[PDB]
Design a binder for this molecule. Sequence first.
Ligand SMILES: Nc1ncnc2c1ncn2[C@@H]1O[C@H](COP(=O)(O)OP(=O)(O)OP(O)(O)=S)[C@@H](O)[C@H]1O
Ligand SMILES: Nc1ncnc2c1ncn2[C@@H]1O[C@H](COP(=O)(O)OP(=O)(O)OP(O)(O)=S)[C@@H](O)[C@H]1O
Ligand SMILES: [Mg+2]
Ligand SMILES: [Mg+2]
Lengths: 446, 453
Amino acid sequence: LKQKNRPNRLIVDEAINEDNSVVSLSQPKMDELQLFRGDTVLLKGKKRREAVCIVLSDDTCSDEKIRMNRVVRNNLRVRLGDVISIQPCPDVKYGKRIHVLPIDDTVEGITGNLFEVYLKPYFLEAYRPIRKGDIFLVHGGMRAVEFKVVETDPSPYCIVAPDTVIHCEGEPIKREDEEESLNEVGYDDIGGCRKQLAQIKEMVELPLRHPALFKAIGVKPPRGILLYGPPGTGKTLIARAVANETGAFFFLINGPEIMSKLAGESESNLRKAFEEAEKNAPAIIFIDELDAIAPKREKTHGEVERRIVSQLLTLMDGLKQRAHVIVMAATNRPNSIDPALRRFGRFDREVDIGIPDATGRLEILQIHTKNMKLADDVDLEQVANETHGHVGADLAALCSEAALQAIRKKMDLIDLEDETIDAEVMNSLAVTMDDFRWALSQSNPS
Amino acid sequence: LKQKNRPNRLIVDEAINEDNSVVSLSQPKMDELQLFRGDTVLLKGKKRREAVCIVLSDDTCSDEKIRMNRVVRNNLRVRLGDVISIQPCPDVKYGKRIHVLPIDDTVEGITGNLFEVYLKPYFLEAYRPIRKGDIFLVHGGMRAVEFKVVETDPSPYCIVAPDTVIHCEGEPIKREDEEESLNEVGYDDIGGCRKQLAQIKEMVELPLRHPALFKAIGVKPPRGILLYGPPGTGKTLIARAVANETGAFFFLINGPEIMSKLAGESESNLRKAFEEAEKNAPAIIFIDELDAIAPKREKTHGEVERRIVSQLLTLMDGLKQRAHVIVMAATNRPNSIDPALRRFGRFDREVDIGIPDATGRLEILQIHTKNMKLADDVDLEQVANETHGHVGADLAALCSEAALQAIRKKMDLIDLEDETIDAEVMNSLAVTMDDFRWALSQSNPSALRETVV
Ligand SMILES: Nc1ncnc2c1ncn2[C@@H]1O[C@H](COP(=O)(O)OP(=O)(O)OP(O)(O)=S)[C@@H](O)[C@H]1O
Ligand SMILES: Nc1ncnc2c1ncn2[C@@H]1O[C@H](COP(=O)(O)OP(=O)(O)OP(O)(O)=S)[C@@H](O)[C@H]1O
Ligand SMILES: [Mg+2]
Ligand SMILES: [Mg+2]
């Protein structure tokens, strides 16, 4: 499973100064796709992000490309060169009411009514399509304020008509909250695991999306997938990526979290997890650190511990064939899991999330430095070559250490007590190859 | 115990275009059986399925055969060539009301009042016999809708007379739910176990059905039957089969399920199991994964664990001789079970559910591919010969892997994101002998043939 050419899959191209509500295609592409000037369209990017836009023809736009500005790209979680899909969006109703909120660092020193100075002029007679979760910037007077759509009615998208009530009351959204959302883990945040992610799409996502495929040929897909491998290889990261990328309902079950609960509560929470999944099928259940809740029914002296293992076995068996629920799990101690959980019809497929090679190490180093300020002498391939035996977590730690060393080198220009770090220290901060070589000397993968 | 020739046992034969309410016999058969034109009859198929029909003579019908259409065959869970039984059904009364529901995939884009367009014209002045659980198809305008009979009054069958109230209101039945039902496990879904299924019928079904036989000769039949053998040999499958085939009440007790319950709740559920069985006798109790609830009273450090074992012992002893309850159990670790449970009067009979041979393996492979699209080059006897050391579960896994490989080969025509798989990919999908060879050559099937020489 790689990415196939389809007529509605298009490469993201720039449109500086373009309005937030507009995307451009070439006329032949529009003709191919049966899209007419002014049509509302639905765009799909990464990590299940969507955007509703107006489509306009552009004779400077290549057939295979879509022009869109930076606001739309950010909402779609995509960069220039990425691929998106476009489809008609005919069903879109005029809005009854919408609720948007300002981002806290764009309104410090509250001056000017937000509705009157920003939103009213932005939406005035424009009939903008909007979607819940959109972030958009607006200029008002000599200032710019960033807003988030928190709710729309109808949900999750509508047209902002003259009659749509615009609510902007409440506590401003924190930049840190939205920045945490903005860099939620996707498949792109996973290095050195191309083969495994493909195993995962074929065993988990494909049967949940297209069960007709499996019915057609007359095969029941396996329902239990164990990720295993040593610590820090990316098992939990992959879970986060699946959670954020899948089209199914996702229910995370954390091993130590169940085990931390009162006797009786552990079992109950497991049952509720499976029930929620079932009710919301198609669904994925992910049981992280499976060994914590399901060790061999001999290496648990506790009656409650054996009981919880029994409870999971019952829940795995209890999942009807037509439930459309795939259970994923992860462990760094697979030989410690009760063998009963590994029988036909339970966890009977396995995916080795192991030690990356040099090429995978480089992938991982590029991912973990993407938001890091690097000097021009940083050679990551050279770092990749010198980190044999390192897994993903050792590489992220190495990157952090090089950064921390870069900061340590300015401790002669920082005083802990100042309320403000000197701007020119802030502006010039870069991680150098030397900082990396120094971390390479401190890095111990154990 | 094999199948005996009886005058009312007949071979299922085709009747294309026949009405859903009609079966045909030869006139001599009808004479033999004392059946007259238009009589209502009760048909019995597999997995306790029944059908009520009208019987008509047919001079093209062999004496030993019964003609019936595809609707009736599906209701009886039988195919062409299977045997069914027929008997008069004189007791049948006009229904006060019946309730049916459409199948969801037959009503998408809800066009038409279902009663007026389909049911009314289907039942109009026809006086159709119908049974709870029947599925039947009806054409109305340019469409066809499949319905299930969910309830009848009287129950479970009646005649749909002019004055019978037909209800079709409610949420449509899911096709997936009925496909699951249709493919519920029977004795035909168990391969390579002929000898053991006979042991089971002789030790379980026979004393429950004909206790007089055992009384007459003066013998108390054993009341505890332990199925044992290695993992994936079909112990649970057999339990499913028995549950769906037996004429008795069936109460399943799952080991890990009892063990997952609160201290005190485990013991209570065991008691309730035995009580329900007793109240509903003749009954079978099946305790799957017995080792989970009854390991040796030394290899359990838990007071509650020892208490549960004691509870089962008490419940086994507590079953009066006239209770008409047979307890089956299954385990893949029989030497781990408390020896007290294997004394005279408890689990004192045993059935070895073991490794199949090549002929058994082939049976298993035909069962597991019956609903699978096979290419013409698939040679299952050859697959049987190349799976030494394989049990049932390994054969089902082998089949699934071949099919999964077949799908993997089309991953250049499938994009995960499409709403719809391309039709001609759907239509042409078949598992080939190469797909099977690929599955056979895999680490796991290959490591497994060494295991049993
Ligand atoms: N394949 C990878 N690609 C990119 N970053 C990775 C990878 N593996 C690990 N990392 C980094 O290391 C961090 C910790 O890894 P986790 O996914 O929590 O390890 P894990 O495999 O779940 O470990 P265990 O078994 O719970 S100790 C991640 O959150 C990433 O920042
Ligand atoms: N004799 C058989 N005939 C046909 N199919 C079988 C047979 N045995 C196993 N299978 C297949 O393998 C699957 C698992 O078999 P089960 O009956 O659950 O195994 P089991 O013997 O109960 O295993 P344990 O002891 O609980 S691990 C079944 O659902 C069938 O698909
Ligand atoms: Mg982890
Ligand atoms: Mg079993």
